[PDB]
């Protein structure tokens, strides 16, 4: 209707919908996801055999 | 004689010679040496004592 952003949960198990609110702010969000560290790569090798 | 390419087997086991044929077209080889990976260096150190 030009009002609700509709998203498809491609892994839904049965059949349902959830209506929710999100404001212009981040504090006004219901649930928070607050990344501190993300996808930090770690690298080395096992020196015994040098495989990465 | 201007005809045979003579090489010295610096590690010959007894005392002999081998006469062989090698054509201008490498397919006319008898035996083929076909390198794929040439001396890839590996590096590392063991973190328990840090020796390289």
From Swiss-Prot, chains A, B:
Q: How is it modified after translation?
A: A proteolytic cleavage by the prohead core protein protease gives rise to the mature major capsid protein during virus maturation.
Give the family this protein belongs to, as stated in its UniProt record: Belongs to the Tevenvirinae major capsid protein family.
Q: Subunit structure of this entry?
A: Homohexamer. Interacts with the portal protein. Interacts with the capsid vertex protein that forms pentamers. Interacts with hoc; one hoc molecule associates with each capsid hexamer. Interacts with soc; this interaction reinforces the capsid structure. A total of 960 subunits of the major capsid protein forms the 160 hexamers.
Q: What does it do? A: Major capsid protein that self-associates to form hexamers, building most of the capsid in association with pentons made of the capsid vertex protein and one dodecamer of the portal protein. The major capsid protein self-associates to form 160 hexamers, building most of the T=13 laevo capsid. Folding of major capsid protein requires the assistance of two chaperones, the host chaperone groL acting with the phage encoded gp23-specific chaperone, gp31. The capsid also contains two nonessential outer capsid proteins, Hoc and Soc, which decorate the capsid surface.
Please report the name of this protein according to its UniProt entry. Major capsid protein
Organism encoding this protein: Enterobacteria phage T4 (Bacteriophage T4)
What fragment of the whole protein does this chain represent? 418 to 469 of 521
């Amino acid at each position: 209707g030009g009002k609700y952003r509709v998203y498809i949960d491609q892994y839904a198990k049965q059949d349902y919908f959830t209506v929710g609110y999100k404001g212009p702010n981040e504090m006004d969000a219901g649930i928070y996801y607050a990344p501190y560290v993300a996808l930090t790569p770690l690298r080395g090798s096992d020196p015994k055999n040098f495989q990465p």
